[PDB]
Amino acid sequence: SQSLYREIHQLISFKDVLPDKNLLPDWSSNKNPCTFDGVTCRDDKVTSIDLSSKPLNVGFSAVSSSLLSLTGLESLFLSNSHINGSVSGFKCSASLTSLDLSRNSLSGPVTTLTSLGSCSGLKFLNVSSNTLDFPGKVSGGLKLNSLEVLDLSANSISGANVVGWVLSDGCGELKHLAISGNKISGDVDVSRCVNLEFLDVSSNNFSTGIPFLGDCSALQHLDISGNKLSGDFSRAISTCTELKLLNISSNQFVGPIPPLPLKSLQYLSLAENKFTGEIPDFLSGACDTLTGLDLSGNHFYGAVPPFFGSCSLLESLALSSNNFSGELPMDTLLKMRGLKVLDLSFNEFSGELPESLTNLSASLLTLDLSSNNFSGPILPNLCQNPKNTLQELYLQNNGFTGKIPPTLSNCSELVSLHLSFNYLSGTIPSSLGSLSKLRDLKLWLNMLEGEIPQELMYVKTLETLILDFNDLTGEIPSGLSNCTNLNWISLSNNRLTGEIPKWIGRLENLAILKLSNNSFSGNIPAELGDCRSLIWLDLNTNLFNGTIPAAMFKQSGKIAANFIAGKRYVYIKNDGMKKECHGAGNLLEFQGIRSEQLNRLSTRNPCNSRVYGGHTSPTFDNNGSMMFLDMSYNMLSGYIPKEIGSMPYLFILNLGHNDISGSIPDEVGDLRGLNILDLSSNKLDGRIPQAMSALTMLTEIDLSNNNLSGPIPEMGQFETFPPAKFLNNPGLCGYPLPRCD
Ligand SMILES: *[C@@H]1O[C@H](CO)[C@@H](O[C@@H]2O[C@H](CO)[C@@H](O[C@@H]3O[C@H](CO)[C@@H](O)[C@H](O[C@H]4O[C@H](CO)[C@@H](O)[C@H](O)[C@@H]4O)[C@@H]3O)[C@H](O)[C@H]2NC(C)=O)[C@H](O)[C@H]1NC(C)=O
Ligand SMILES: *[C@@H]1O[C@H](CO)[C@@H](O[C@@H]2O[C@H](CO)[C@@H](O[C@@H]3O[C@H](CO)[C@@H](O)[C@H](O[C@H]4O[C@H](CO)[C@@H](O)[C@H](O)[C@@H]4O)[C@@H]3O)[C@H](O)[C@H]2NC(C)=O)[C@H](O)[C@H]1NC(C)=O
Ligand SMILES: *[C@@H]1O[C@H](CO)[C@@H](O[C@@H]2O[C@H](CO)[C@@H](O[C@@H]3O[C@H](CO)[C@@H](O)[C@H](O[C@H]4O[C@H](CO)[C@@H](O)[C@H](O)[C@@H]4O)[C@@H]3O)[C@H](O)[C@H]2NC(C)=O)[C@H](O)[C@H]1NC(C)=O
Ligand SMILES: CC(C)[C@H](C)[C@@H](O)[C@H](O)[C@@H](C)[C@H]1CC[C@H]2[C@@H]3COC(=O)[C@H]4C[C@H](O)[C@H](O)C[C@]4(C)[C@H]3CC[C@]12C
Ligand SMILES: *[C@@H]1O[C@H](CO)[C@@H](O)[C@H](O)[C@H]1NC(C)=O
Ligand SMILES: *[C@@H]1O[C@H](CO)[C@@H](O)[C@H](O)[C@H]1NC(C)=O
Ligand SMILES: *[C@@H]1O[C@H](CO)[C@@H](O)[C@H](O)[C@H]1NC(C)=O
């Protein structure tokens, strides 16, 4: 036929306008398209093309002129294909049924989509994750009332009543509307959409009316979360008898949990609102269908109603960040046959752990009991039940006394263990080396003694070791050389000894090494310079000596950090007020702990009030450098190597209280991101290099107690700092000091 001749010529003309033609290397003229990678054929005719996740790097016009006009094409999938430009009028084949253009760079007003009406058979349209917008006045209509599925999520659509604009010309055919991740406001009226099954209007700018749903005859999925809605949603969804998922989380709802349609309900989320009072007895009505419940981050209180035993289908129960109290209602949890995730974190549950809990170790994937008021010992008999499935165990920030049960090694599926912030004595059981899947061992702020288990080598998956604030002794176990995935090692405020092993250079994933306030010694390993993920080095308050190896900076400009991101931390800034408190500040892991309990450190730390929190976020993804370097309060000597200046992402530099001599390298002036510079109490001499006048981001400097001399630089930021920062430098003069003689 002709369409065959035309099919091949159209496909090859498309290939030919690609900047990287090597992308469709098996496409070629005088070959049958049905043999082409990306092509679906039925009876020797093209019915579908899928060029998704290939960087085609061409514009929509190339697509609509070559591809969308092919006779018989039924579906075109071009998600994440680097298509830019915008939709305009074109001839479209009547067979085309699905168009997926999601995750591209389509730009322009959302009114451009209206020109896709050329496609008389189009029923499914995904244009999510682009940059389509709605400039100014919202008038007219989208005019695609034949659609069954429309996805406009994650665009740049800012406007009021955009939904009415979408639905203006009719929605009798519409089954699934998603438009989340925009900035849409106003009214949502889908009452004329009597076949609508799926509505996601989440993460927008709604702060007035609740969506109006009319008879709600077909609605199964309703997501209005992530807005600023308040008011009577109970009445709005009261006609909704087929509802399976109701997500109203992250809004401004207040009062008690009101009546709900439970007979079909599988997923319910009320999280992150201002609901008050206690879980009502009437929710037992969903115990026949309910698979997921989330009431986290409200003001709920009291106990977990006993009715939950009937919710035998309930897989996840999340109630964290309320004020639930009482003992672990094991009598109810043991009936929830299907329970997999249990999250009661950040409440005020109390008492010891009931012995019956050891049964759930054979069904649960996650047990999150962090930040409560539990007391007593960790159940030794825990994970007796053969085939222990438990993956995550979070018991941090409670009142647990006793030893760490070696029995925990039987929970062989364990990926995450967090026993921090308790009162645990005894040693770190050697048997934890048996947890072949463990990624996180977090035991910080307890009273753990003895040495760090050599047997920890037997854990190949290990990524984080957080042992700060204990009573550990002995040296860094040579065995740890084996855990090559470590990206965060924190051993501060113990009584460790020995040197820093030279095998640290081995771990190419280590991003944070914190060894402060112990008794480590010897020289700084030039081997640290071999770590290619290292961004935070805190060796303060120890007994290291020798000279700062220039080699430790060899990685600067090559540093990659990706795995360390997204982890909750607190950074506690040192105010130079108390002389017993050392270092720039303490970076501490802080997943599942209340800041209100930082006061617990008072007895272990001479530091008093300045707490930064967040989630780790490197300032680059690649080609970075160290961001933090503290070696204060040691016995280092010799001169600062000029390579010190080679780290453009360095925010903090503390080398204070050592025996460093010679003169401040002029390369410090290259450290353009520097916020803090402490070189106090050393033996540095010569002149403050004028180059340092180029630093623009210094919020703090200290050069006091050296043998520096000559004039303080008048340009840059020096005039900004008080005299104290320069005291005890005999030959030093110039404002803020007395003028030079
Ligand atoms: C409009 O297009 C968007 C963008 O593609 C689309 O959203 C994305 O959908 C996909 C699935 O269709 C999501 O990817 C999933 O992510 C989950 C984790 O959250 C994974 O578990 C899933 O993996 C499963 O399936 C894979 C094969 O697809 C298997 O390899 C794997 O083993 C699992 O079985 C899956 O990868 C994606 O997260 C969303 N979100 C994005 C990218 O924004 C959206 O659904 C489209 N809209 C409509 C109406 O179709
Ligand atoms: C019930 O609803 C809640 C609340 O909406 C929901 O949890 C949320 O999931 C969404 C994903 O749909 C999360 O949103 C993302 O947050 C991450 C992390 O900060 C961001 O990186 C993401 O930004 C991207 O996507 C945006 C579009 O949504 C884009 O505009 C942006 O440019 C980025 O590409 C995104 O915002 C959100 O973090 C959570 N919220 C909370 C509080 O957990 C939950 O999953 C729902 N439950 C069920 C089962 O449906
Ligand atoms: C490096 O490690 C060591 C080991 O922790 C650390 O020494 C400890 O410092 C803390 C905090 O200063 C000390 O805690 C004190 O304990 C005594 C009793 O032994 C108490 O009397 C003290 O109480 C005072 O402060 C309280 C509030 O914090 C007040 O309520 C009270 O009225 C008192 O004023 C205080 O809690 C602890 O004794 C030492 N332990 C050791 C081993 O010496 C050291 O400070 C760390 N170094 C650095 C640089 O951080
Ligand atoms: C990359 C991570 C490991 C890291 C924790 C990161 O996520 C985090 O944002 C870091 C970069 C933060 C945590 C503490 C922050 C510092 C807080 O303490 C310092 O006093 C302030 C003072 C002042 O505000 C300066 O502008 C920056 C400055 C000095 C901050 C520099 C950036 C931080 C160091
Ligand atoms: C589309 O992307 C290409 C590649 O960068 C560019 O040359 C062209 O100008 C872009 N078109 C639009 C509309 O931005
Ligand atoms: C959300 O809507 C309000 C009211 O229309 C508007 O004033 C505001 O600009 C919008 N906020 C955002 C974050 O765009
Ligand atoms: C939370 O519950 C506890 C224990 O019953 C109660 O004493 C406390 O007042 C509650 N917290 C608040 C602030 O309501």
UniProtKB/Swiss-Prot annotation:
Site (Interacts with SERK1): residue numbering on this chain = 675, 735
Identify the keywords attached in UniProt to this record, alphabetized. Answer: ATP-binding, Brassinosteroid signaling pathway, Cell membrane, Endosome, Glycoprotein, Kinase, Leucine-rich repeat, Lipid-binding, Membrane, Nucleotide-binding, Phosphoprotein, Receptor, Repeat, Serine/threonine-protein kinase, Signal, Steroid-binding, Transferase, Transmembrane, Transmembrane helix, Tyrosine-protein kinase
> Is Phosphoprotein among this UniProt entry's keywords?
yes
Post-translational modification remark: Phosphorylated on at least 12 sites, with a preference for Ser residues.
Impact noted for substituting residue 614 to D: In bri1-6; brassinosteroid-insensitive semi-dwarf mutant
GO cellular component terms, semicolon-separated: endosome; endosome membrane; plasma membrane; protein-containing complex
The residue spans of each LRR repeat are: 43-70, 71-93, 94-118, 120-141, 144-169, 171-193, 194-216, 217-240, 241-262, 263-286, 288-310, 311-335, 336-360, 362-385, 387-411, 413-435, 436-459, 460-483, 485-507, 508-531, 533-555, 623-647, 648-671, 672-695, 697-720
Sites of glycosylation? 84, 126, 205, 247, 323, 359, 373, 410, 482, 517, 545, 608, 623, 707
What EC designation does it have? Answer: 2.7.10.1, 2.7.11.1
Residues where brassinolide binds: 569, 612, 617, 675
Q: What happens when the gene is disrupted?
A: Dwarf phenotype and aberrant leaf shape.
Catalytic reactions on record = L-seryl-[protein] + ATP = O-phospho-L-seryl-[protein] + ADP + H(+); L-threonyl-[protein] + ATP = O-phospho-L-threonyl-[protein] + ADP + H(+); L-tyrosyl-[protein] + ATP = O-phospho-L-tyrosyl-[protein] + ADP + H(+)
Q: Name one GO molecular function term.
A: identical protein binding
Q: Name one GO biological process term.
A: pollen exine formation
- SERK1 binding: annotated span: 610-612, 696-699, 716-720
Q: What is known of its domains?
A: Contains one leucine-zipper motif and two pairs of conservatively spaced Cys (Cys pair 1 and 2) involved in forming heterodimers. A 70 amino acid island between the 21st and the 22th LRR is essential for the binding of brassinosteroids.
Other comments on record = Binding of brassinosteroid induces intramolecular autophosphorylation of BRI1. Interaction with BAK1 activates both receptor kinases and the full activation of either receptor kinase requires transphosphorylation by their partners. Homodimerizes in the absence of ligand and binds brassinosteroid in the absence of its coreceptor BAK1. The bri1-9 mutation produces a fully active protein with a subtle conformational change that is recognized for reglucosylation by UGGT, resulting in its endoplasmic reticulum retention via Glc(1)Man(9)GlcNAc(2)-calreticulin/calnexin interaction.
Functional note = Receptor with a dual specificity kinase activity acting on both serine/threonine- and tyrosine-containing substrates. Regulates, in response to brassinosteroid binding, a signaling cascade involved in plant development, including expression of light- and stress-regulated genes, promotion of cell elongation, normal leaf and chloroplast senescence, and flowering. Binds brassinolide (BL), and less effectively castasterone (CS), but not 2,3,22,23-O-tetramethylbrassinolide or ecdysone. May be involved in a feedback regulation of brassinosteroid biosynthesis.
Q: What family name appears in the similarity comment?
A: Belongs to the protein kinase superfamily. Ser/Thr protein kinase family.
Question: What is the name of this protein?
Answer: Protein BRASSINOSTEROID INSENSITIVE 1
Q: Which organism is it from?
A: Arabidopsis thaliana (Mouse-ear cress)
